[PDB]
Design a protein around this ligand. Structure first.
Ligand SMILES: NC(=O)c1ccc[n+]([C@@H]2O[C@H](COP(=O)([O-])OP(=O)(O)OC[C@H]3O[C@@H](n4cnc5c(N)ncnc54)[C@H](O)[C@@H]3O)[C@@H](O)[C@H]2O)c1
Ligand SMILES: NC(=O)c1ccc[n+]([C@@H]2O[C@H](COP(=O)([O-])OP(=O)(O)OC[C@H]3O[C@@H](n4cnc5c(N)ncnc54)[C@H](O)[C@@H]3O)[C@@H](O)[C@H]2O)c1
Ligand SMILES: Cc1cn([C@H]2C[C@H](O)[C@@H](COP(=O)(O)OP(=O)(O)O[C@H]3OC[C@@H](O)[C@H](O)[C@H]3O)O2)c(=O)[nH]c1=O
Ligand SMILES: Cc1cn([C@H]2C[C@H](O)[C@@H](COP(=O)(O)OP(=O)(O)O[C@H]3OC[C@@H](O)[C@H](O)[C@H]3O)O2)c(=O)[nH]c1=O
Lengths: 346, 346
C-alpha cells in the first residue's frame, strides 16, 4: 500500500488481469492503470467488471516510448506482465517475442530509470531450462539442483523462454548499472479462470465442452509445476511491497504433475472416457520437467500459497469454463485451426 | 571446411584481426565482411587486404534484406558485430539493444533459413563478476573462482546484458530449430587495431599525445588479458572443429589488475610511475574476470601462443607508436567524449 498509482502492463491477459482483480479487491488505496496492446491474448472482458475510477485501461504497446513516458510520469510503480507468452507461437513466429518481451521490457526499464520508480518484472521458471524426471534423479526431486532455485543457471530452450530470460538479464543489469528499483519473480505454470484457450488446461477443458478431442503432446510424460493464479498474485504483491531490491524470488506451490495425469483428471471430472483424446505431434525442443523451490519467498517474505489442492482448483477451473462459454466460444475454431497447421494425430 | 564466410563486424578490432588471420592462413577462403562502420569500424583496418579473398559490404546486421542477400551465398557466419564498450552503454544503451540483440536475432534467422554454420563471438562479461584472489580461499584456483562453461550468466551492464541475451537466443535457436551454432566467451583482448576508447590503447596513445593516462578509481579491477591473435585461432578452431550447440571459453591465464597494467605501460614508455590521473570510477564496475579455458584446450587442442604479456604489451605499444596516423584523428574526440562523464579525482 506504499504504491498508490501503479501501472500493470499486460493486465488484460490471464495472469495480469487476475492480479488487477487482486489489487482491486484487496488494496483499495491503489489506482491501477493497465497498459495492454490487446493482442490475440488480451481481452477487455477480463477487466470489464472493475474498470472505472479505480482501474483504467490504456490500449497501447509497451514498446511505444512516448506512451510509456506519459503513463510512467504519473505512476509510482510498474508491474510488468506484458509478454508474448506461448511457446508454440514462438516456434512458429518468434518476431513478436523479440519485440515485446525484450524491446518492450527495455522501454519500460528506461521509463522506470527516468522517473525513478519501482519496477517488478514478472517472469517464468522456463528461463532455467529443463530438468530430468524425478525417477531419473538421484534425490528423486528433493536433492540440491533437482528443483530450480534463485541460484539456478539460466538455460532457456525456446524463442519464448529465451526472450523472457533475456528480459530478466537486462532488468538485473539495470539494477546494478543504474540503480533501478527492480525485483524479479519467476513463477511456475499458472492455471485458473481467464486463461487463453491456446494453453494446455483450458484447451482440453474447452475442447471437451465443444465436442473436440483433447490433445496430448507425445506420450505426456512432461512435468509442469502447477500454481493457481491467485497464489501468483499474492506472491507478486509480497515481492512488490516487501522484496529486497535487485533480488529474484521464485514462486511455486509444490504442484508437479505430468501432462498425461492432468489430462486424465480433466477427462474424469468431465465424465469422459480415459482414452477419449488424441496424441499429437510433440513440440520442438519440448522442455521435460519444471519444478520450483519457493523457499526464499516463503521464508523471507512470509508468503504461502492457499490453493494447494490441485484437484479442487481444477474442478473450479472446469466449472469456470463451463459457466463462461460465451467468453471463449468464438475463439475456438481459429485456435484449433492454427494448431492444425503444425499438429497431426500420432 | 568453409569456403565463403561472412564476418560481421570485421572492420572493428577483434573482427579485423580475424579477417587478417583468414587472409594470411586460409587464402582459399573468401570472406565477406558485413560492417556498419560505426565510430568503431574503420576501413583502414582492412584496406590493405581487400581483394579477391576479402570484400567489405557496408551495412547493418539488423537489415534483414541485406543479410538475406549475403547469407544466400555463404556457408558460415562468424559474428563479431556489436556495440562493444561498457562506458558507452552506460551513457546510451539504445544501440546495444539494436545491434547486440536485434542484430544477432536477424543473423540467426538468416542462418536458420539457409541452414548455415553460425559462430557467435561473445565475452566473459556475461558471467558477471568475481572477487579478487586475495578474498578467495583458493586464491583464484579453487572451484568457482574462475568462470567455466557451467557458470551462471549474471551480467552487470547494458553491454554485457545484451551480449548475454544474444548468447541465450543463439542457444535457444540451436535447441528449437537446429541452427548449427557455436558460442565462444573470451576474456579481454588486446593488440593492434584496438579503438583508443579502450583501456590499453587509451593509455598508450594518451602518453604519445602528451595526455595523462586515466585509471578508474584506484585500479583494483582485474581483467584476464589475451592477445587478439590467440582469440582468432580460438575462433577458427571452434568454427572448424567445434561441437554444435557448445560454448567454449577462451582465455590465456593473464589476470592483472588495471594499476599493474598501467604501471607497466608507464615503465615501458619511460614515464614516471605516478604520471597518471585517477578518474571517476565506472557505475556497476565489474571487479575481476577470470577464464578457465580447459574445455577448449582439452577438446580442440587450442593453445595460446602469446602468453608473455610483457612482450605482447611491448609490441602493442610499438604498434600504436608506429601507426600514429591510425589513431590521431580520433584522440581529441574520444577524450572530449569521456570528459562529459569522467573527471580527475581530487
Ligand atoms: N501463464 C503462465 O503460466 C506464466 C508462468 C509465469 C509467468 N508468465 C509470465 O506472466 C506474464 C503474463 O502471462 P499470461 O499467461 O497472462 O499471458 P497472456 O498471453 O494471457 O497475456 C499477455 C498479455 O500481454 C499483452 N501484450 C502482449 N504484447 C504486448 C505489448 N507489446 N504491449 C502491451 N501489452 C502486450 C496481451 O495483449 C495480453 O493481455 C508473462 O510475462 C509471462 O511470460 C506466465
Ligand atoms: N574487445 C574484447 O575484449 C572482447 C572480448 C571478447 C569478445 N568481445 C566481442 O567481440 C566482438 C567484437 O569486439 P571488438 O572489441 O572488435 O569491437 P569494436 O568496437 O572494435 O568493433 C565493433 C564492430 O562492429 C561494427 N558494428 C557495430 N554495430 C553494427 C551493426 N549494427 N551492424 C554491422 N556492424 C556493426 C562496428 O562498425 C565495428 O567495426 C563483439 O561481439 C564483442 O562483444 C570483445
Ligand atoms: C497446448 C498443449 C500443451 N500441451 C503440453 C505442452 C506442455 O508440456 C504442457 C503445458 O503447455 P502450455 O500450456 O503451452 O504451457 P508451457 O509451455 O508449460 O508454458 C506455460 O507455462 C510457463 C509460462 O512461462 C508460459 O507463458 C505458459 O504458457 O502441456 C499438450 O500436451 N497439449 C496441448 O494442447
Ligand atoms: C577506458 C578505461 C578503462 N579503465 C578500466 C576499466 C576496466 O576495469 C578496465 C578495462 O576497461 P575497458 O577497456 O573498457 O574494457 P572492459 O570493460 O573490461 O571490456 C572489454 O573486455 C570485455 C569485452 O567484452 C568488451 O567489449 C571490452 O571493451 O580498465 C581504466 O582504468 N581507464 C580507462 O581509461
Amino acid at each position: 500500500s506504499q504504491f498508490k498509482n501503479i501501472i500493470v502492463t499486460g493486465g488484460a491477459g490471464f495472469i495480469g488481469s487476475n492480479f488487477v482483480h487482486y489489487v482491486y479487491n484487496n488494496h483499495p488505496d491503489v489506482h491501477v492503470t493497465v497498459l495492454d496492446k490487446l493482442t490475440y491474448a488480451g481481452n477487455k472482458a477480463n477487466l470489464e467488471a472493475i474498470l472505472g475510477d479505480r482501474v483504467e485501461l490504456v490500449v497501447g504497446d509497451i514498446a511505444d516510448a512516448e506512451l510509456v513516458d506519459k503513463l510512467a510520469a504519473k505512476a509510482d510503480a510498474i508491474v510488468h506482465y506484458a509478454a508474448e507468452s506461448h511457446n508454440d507461437n514462438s516456434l512458429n513466429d518468434p518476431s513478436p517475442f523479440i519485440h515485446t518481451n525484450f524491446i518492450g521490457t527495455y522501454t519500460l526499464l528506461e521509463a522506470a530509470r527516468k522517473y525513478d520508480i519501482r519496477f517488478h518484472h514478472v517472469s517464468t521458471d522456463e528461463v532455467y531450462g529443463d530438468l530430468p524426471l524425478r525417477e531419473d534423479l538421484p534425490g528423486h526431486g528433493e536433492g540440491p539442483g533437482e528443483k530450480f532455485t534463485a541460484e539456478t543457471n539460466y538455460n532457456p530452450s525456446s524463442p519464448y523462454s529465451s526472450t523472457k530470460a533475456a528480459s530478466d538479464l537486462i532488468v538485473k543489469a539495470w539494477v546494478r548499472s543504474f540503480g533501478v528499483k527492480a525485483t524479479i519473480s519467476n513463477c511456475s505454470n499458472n492455471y485458473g479462470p481467464y486463461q487463453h484457450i491456446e494453453k494446455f488446461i483450458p484447451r482440453q477443458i474447452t475442447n471437451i465442452l465443444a465436442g473436440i478431442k483433447p490433445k496430448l503432446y507425445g506420450e505426456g510424460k512432461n512435468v509442469r509445476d502447477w500454481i493457481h493464479t491467485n497464489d501468483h498474485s499474492t506472491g507478486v504483491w509480497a515481492i512488490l511491497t516487501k522484496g529486497r531490491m535487485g533480488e529474484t524470488y521464485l514462486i511455486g506451490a509444490d504442484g508437479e504433475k505430468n501432462n498425461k495425469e492432468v489430462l486424465e483428471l480433466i477427462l474424469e471430472k468431465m465424465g469422459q472416457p480415459k482414452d477419449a483424446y488424441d496424441h499429437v505431434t510433440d513440440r520442438a525442443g519440448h522442455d521435460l520437467r519444471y519444478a520450483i523451490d519457493a523457499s526464499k519467498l516463503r521464508d523471507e517474505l512470509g508468503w504461502t500459497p492457499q490453493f494447494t489442492d490441485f484437484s479442487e482448483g481444477l474442478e473450479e477451473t472446469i466449472q469456470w469454463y463451463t459457466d463462461n462459454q460465451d467468453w471463449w466460444k468464438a475463439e475456438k475454431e481459429a485456435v484449433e485451426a492454427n494448431y492444425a497447421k503444425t499438429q497431426e494425430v500420432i
